[PDB]
Amino acid sequence: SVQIVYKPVDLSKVTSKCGSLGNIHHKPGGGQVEVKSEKLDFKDRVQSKIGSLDNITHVPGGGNKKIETHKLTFR
Amino acid sequence: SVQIVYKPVDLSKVTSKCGSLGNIHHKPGGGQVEVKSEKLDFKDRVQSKIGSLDNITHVPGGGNKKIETHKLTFR
Amino acid sequence: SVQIVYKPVDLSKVTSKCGSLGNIHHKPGGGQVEVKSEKLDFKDRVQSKIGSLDNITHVPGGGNKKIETHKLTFR
Amino acid sequence: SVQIVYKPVDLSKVTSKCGSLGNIHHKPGGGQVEVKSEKLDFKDRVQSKIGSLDNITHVPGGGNKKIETHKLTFR
Amino acid sequence: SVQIVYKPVDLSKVTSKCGSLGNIHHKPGGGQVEVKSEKLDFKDRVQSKIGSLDNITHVPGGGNKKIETHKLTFR
Amino acid sequence: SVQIVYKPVDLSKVTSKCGSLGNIHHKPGGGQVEVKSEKLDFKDRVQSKIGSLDNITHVPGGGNKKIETHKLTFR
Amino acid sequence: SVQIVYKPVDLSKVTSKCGSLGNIHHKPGGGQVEVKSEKLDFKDRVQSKIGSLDNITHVPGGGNKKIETHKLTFR
Amino acid sequence: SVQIVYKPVDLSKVTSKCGSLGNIHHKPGGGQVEVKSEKLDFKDRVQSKIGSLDNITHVPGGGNKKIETHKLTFR
Amino acid sequence: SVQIVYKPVDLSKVTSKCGSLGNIHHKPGGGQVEVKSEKLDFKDRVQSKIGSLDNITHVPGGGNKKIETHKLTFR
Amino acid sequence: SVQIVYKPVDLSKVTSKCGSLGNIHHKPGGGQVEVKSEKLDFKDRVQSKIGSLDNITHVPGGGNKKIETHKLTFR
């Protein structure tokens, strides 16, 4: 009675070509940071951060991506 | 009675070509930061951040992307 | 009785070509930041940020994108 | 009784070509920022930000995009 | 009565080519950080961080990715 | 008695081919100069120069030279 | 009696081919100079230079030279 | 009596081929100079230079030279 | 009586091929200089140089030389 | 009586092939110099140099030389 046929075909290509990648320079919090405090009161949770935190330099030669979902559902 | 046939065909291409990529320079919080406080009162949660935080330099040679959903659903 | 046939064909191309990409310069919060406070009162949650935060330099050689949905649904 | 046939064909191309891309310069919050406060009262949630935040330099060599939906629905 | 056939075919390729990748420089918290405190009171959990923390330099030669889900579900 | 004959032939070519030439940035400049002088004596001619002088940026697309001397001399 | 014959032939070629040339950055510059002088004496001509002088950035696409001398001399 | 014959032939080629040339950064510069002088005496000509002088950045795409002398001499 | 014949032949080639040339960084520079002088005496010509002088960055894509002398001499 | 014949033949080739050339970093530089002098005497010409002088970065893609002398001499 029923025939289902699921024949997707994919010959795709995600591509990149880069002769030369360079001279990157990241210089966060190069300056001066000063914190003075007097007579502070805290009745609840404190988080502090002070300085140069969480600084990223992310230099992929590629960095190319592909996402592909397939789904076939039946009642 | 029923025939379903699902034959998508994809020969696509997401492509890039870059001779030379360079001389990038990121210089956040180069200046001076000063914080003075007197007689502060807190009855609830504090989060602080002070300085140069979360600074990103993201330099993919590629950075090319493709997303493809397929779905086939039946009652 | 029923025949469904789903044969999309795609030979597309998203493409770019860039001889030379450079001399980028990002210089946030280069100046001076001063915060003085006296006799502050807080009865509820505080978030602060002070300085140079969350600054991005995003330089993809490619940066090309393609999105493609396919859906075939039946009652 | 019924025949449905879904044969879209796509030979499209989204394309760009750029000899040289450069000399970009982003200089936010170069000046001076001063905040003085006396006798402030807060009965509810505070968010502050002070300085140079969230500044983006986004320089894709490509930056070309294509979106394509296909849908075929039946009762 | 029922025949289901699930024959997706994939000949895809996510690719990159990079002649030379270099001269990367990450210099967070190069400046000076000073914290003075007098007469602080805490009635709840404290987290502090002070200095240069969590700074990443991530330089993959490749960095190319592919994700592919397949699902076939029946009642 | 004497026969002198000078028949040089030249079919040369100096050639160049450059797709794209970009992104030069020269800064012979920015800095400070101070000169203080007390009780100086000069008994012969003086030349001075003070500041940013004679600084060049020379970006020829071609920039190809060809120099050819011919000489024929008789006594 | 005498026969002199000078028949040079040249079919040479000096050639160059460069897809893309980019991203130069010269900074002969930035810094500070100070000169103080007291009770100096000069009995003959003086030349001075003080600052940023005679600094070049030379970026020819071609930049190919060819030099050819010919000489024929008789006594 | 005398027969002299000079028939040089040259079909040479000086050639270069460079896909992509990038990302130069010269900094002959930044630093500090100080000169103090007291009770100096000069009885003959003086030349001085002080600062950033005669500094070159030379980036030819080709940069190919060919030099050829010919000489024919008779007494 | 005398017959002299000079028939050099040259079909040479000086060649180079370089896919991608990148990422140079020269810093002849940064540092401090101080010169103090008291009670010096000069009875003949003086030359001085003080700072960053005559510093080169030479990045030819080709950079191929070929030098050829010819000489024919008779007495 | 005399017959002299000079028929050199050259079909040579000086060749180079380099896929990718990268990532040079020269720092002839950074450091401190101090010179103090008291009661010096010079009765003949003086030359001085003080700082960062005559420093080279030479990165030819090719950089191939070929030198050829020819000489034919008669008395």
Residue numbers in the entry:
A (entry chain C), B (entry chain A), C (entry chain E), D (entry chain G), E (entry chain I), F (entry chain H), ...: 305 to 379
Wording from the paper:
Three types of filaments were observed that were made of two identical protofilaments arranged in different ways. Filament structures were determined to resolutions ranging from 2.3 to 3.4 Å, which allowed us to establish their identity as CTE filament Types I-III. All three filament types were found in the frontal cortex, with Type III being absent from the temporal cortex. The three types of filaments are molecular polymorphs consisting of two identical protofilaments that are linked in different ways. By cryo-EM, the tau fold was identical to that in CTE, SSPE and ALS/PDC. This is the first inherited tauopathy with the CTE fold.
